[PDB]
Design an enzyme around this catalytic site. Structure first.
Site, PDB file in Angstrom:
ATOM      1  N   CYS A  36       4.466   1.540   9.307  1.00  0.00           N
ATOM      2  CA  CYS A  36       4.015   0.405   8.402  1.00  0.00           C
ATOM      3  C   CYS A  36       5.352  -0.221   7.826  1.00  0.00           C
ATOM      4  O   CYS A  36       6.297   0.634   7.592  1.00  0.00           O
ATOM      5  CB  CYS A  36       3.024   0.868   7.570  1.00  0.00           C
ATOM      6  SG  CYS A  36       1.457   1.482   8.104  1.00  0.00           S
ATOM      7  N   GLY A  38       3.426   6.087  10.362  1.00  0.00           N
ATOM      8  CA  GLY A  38       4.730   5.878   9.771  1.00  0.00           C
ATOM      9  C   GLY A  38       5.363   4.503  10.172  1.00  0.00           C
ATOM     10  O   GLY A  38       6.455   4.240   9.779  1.00  0.00           O
ATOM     11  N   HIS A  91       0.948  -1.176  -0.027  1.00  0.00           N
ATOM     12  CA  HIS A  91      -0.007   0.069   0.091  1.00  0.00           C
ATOM     13  C   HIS A  91       0.811   1.354   0.059  1.00  0.00           C
ATOM     14  O   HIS A  91       0.203   2.307   0.056  1.00  0.00           O
ATOM     15  CB  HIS A  91      -0.915   0.045   1.050  1.00  0.00           C
ATOM     16  CG  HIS A  91      -0.449  -0.069   2.498  1.00  0.00           C
ATOM     17  ND1 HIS A  91       0.035   1.297   3.059  1.00  0.00           N
ATOM     18  CD2 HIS A  91      -0.583  -0.595   3.604  1.00  0.00           C
ATOM     19  CE1 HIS A  91       0.424   1.139   4.143  1.00  0.00           C
ATOM     20  NE2 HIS A  91       0.430  -0.170   4.750  1.00  0.00           N
TER      21      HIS A  91
END
Lengths: 301, 301
Positions: free
Chosen positions: B145, B143, B41
């Site tokens: 991920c 932040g 993503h």
């Protein structure tokens, strides 16, 4: 979101751990530049630990009595000396992984990360708080002496603790990296024991603020209290007194949540007087006092 | 002695964390040999996250659309591809710090260490258990991920988790390093939520054994119970069933302490039925289920 007891990433410290052997005694040492730091009790056996004179014991040693191993590579010892309760072994190779570092001594109520090591090999990492009685509630098995505690600030490692011994109650005692013990303990076999402890009030309040930030609000109330009336309840439940400097340190958390410090103190007073009634705060059924205001801000930005 | 929730030393994983930027989206990636792994993503904005077709979105990208930064050094992307929910970016430099590693998928009830990272920079390390509902109760800010979870066995890192998203209840969902989600979750904006959870019974029993090893005995009793009668109480209190394989896994702990597994089950039955009456076990007023039998043996040797 979420709130977890978190250690600093340990890689910078892992690259500094070595094994120090003297006779049949092996433990961990810290290799920074061309010096290895370790507990001085590596130079005695159990017969000496009853009443050791470390000045005598060190004068009877030579450089070749110390085996230092960094992984596979044996490090050649070219000098030795004592600084308080830490031994300094000069070696002929500067550690190429030496981080930027400082030696700092911490205050009771402050936290640090511990890298548990065995035979110079890191095994695990966890957070500790220095208790008001200058012990820590760690996890140390035989062979873990010389494991260090540290904080990290912008790639600078501040070393604050070297592990030396276990007390009868299962808690742990050690020194700063200058070899000065935390608390009234010594590196010999006596009947020494931890003194009475107290709860770190400012940290409990910091953790209640963390809880509000993470959506736990059931313990809040409309009441406020004065610093003085709060401190009368603190003494009753063996909590440390709260000061104006503590209130100031809690400022940013109080601002982020909109709950004045003395408003939160009213909640703590009621939690102390009535308990929780089967509810939990951040997954604890007990009030937690091992998070500093700094620890909370670090996870709650 | 002592018993602490302990993470694996994180240095081997710290050397693998990079920053991946695509457009205005930045997150963490894992750099092993000449491949960088990160959540797919990263290639969409918020308008796409509502109903993304990732095959379409990736075909519209080129190598130069991906900025990979390892510290200061920008890594040149020479290939890209998707594997399930993970993006693989081939780069022109093999990571010289690549550890021995494996990609493994873990079972509910097993634990791992999480290295929380922001902008490719490690910030903290902590232990997590995969809950029976395939979520984890982590600590992740915006932040984070692409932060990974792992175990270490004799210098081999087994990567088992990449962080992808937060669910409405504040718990976390992600994938294995093959990009396959844990649980019934997807990397798009739906009304997805965690399913009902249960308590990991074998881990609670492992932790009661840890407590006995560390000198906590008040909850022991003279009684034993059958597996079947125990499991009738398990279902009542939303505990997972206990199996003979669980009993076998608990064997070494039962042997070290001298307390048969079904003896300990009687203690757990009484703790569930009567509570603790103001006492604590290893410093908890709640029964803890995020330590595996392996975690306990590791600290209780």
């Amino acid at each position: 979101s979420g709130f977890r007891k978190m250690a600093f990433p340990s890689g910078k410290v892992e690259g500094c751990m070595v094994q120090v052997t003297c006779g049949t005694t092996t433990l961990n040492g810290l290799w920074l530049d061309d010096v290895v730091y370790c507990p001085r009790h590596v130079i005695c056996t159990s017969e000496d630990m009853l009443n050791p004179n470390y000045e005598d014991l060190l004068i009877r040693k030579s450089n070749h009595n110390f085996l230092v191993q960094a992984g596979n590579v044996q490090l050649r010892v070219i000098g030795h000396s004592m600084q308080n309760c830490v031994l300094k072994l000069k070696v002929d190779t500067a550690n190429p992984k030496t981080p930027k570092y400082k030696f700092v001594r911490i205050q009771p109520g402050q936290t640090f990360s511990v890298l548990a090591c065995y035979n110079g090999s890191p095994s695990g990492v966890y957070q500790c708080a220095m208790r008001p009685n200058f012990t820590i509630k760690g996890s140390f098995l035989n062979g873990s002496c010389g494991s260090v505690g540290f904080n990290i600030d912008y790639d600078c490692v501040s070393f604050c603790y070297m592990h030396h011994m276990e007390l009868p109650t299962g808690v742990h005692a050690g020194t700063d990296l200058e070899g000065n013990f935390y608390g009234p303990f010594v590196d010999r076999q006596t009947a020494q024991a931890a003194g009475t402890d107290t709860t770190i009030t400012v940290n409990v309040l910091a953790w209640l603020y963390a809880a509000v930030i993470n959506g736990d609000r059931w313990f809040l109330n409309r009441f406020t209290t004065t610093l003085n009336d709060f401190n009368l309840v603190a003494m009753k439940y063996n909590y440390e007194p709260l000061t104006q400097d503590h209130v100031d340190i809690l400022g940013p958390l109080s601002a982020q949540t909109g709950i004045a410090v003395l408003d939160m103190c009213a909640s703590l007073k009621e939690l102390l007087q009535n308990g929780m009634n089967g509810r939990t705060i951040l997954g604890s059924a007990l009030l937690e006092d091992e998070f500093t205001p700094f620890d909370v801000v670090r996870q709650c930005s």
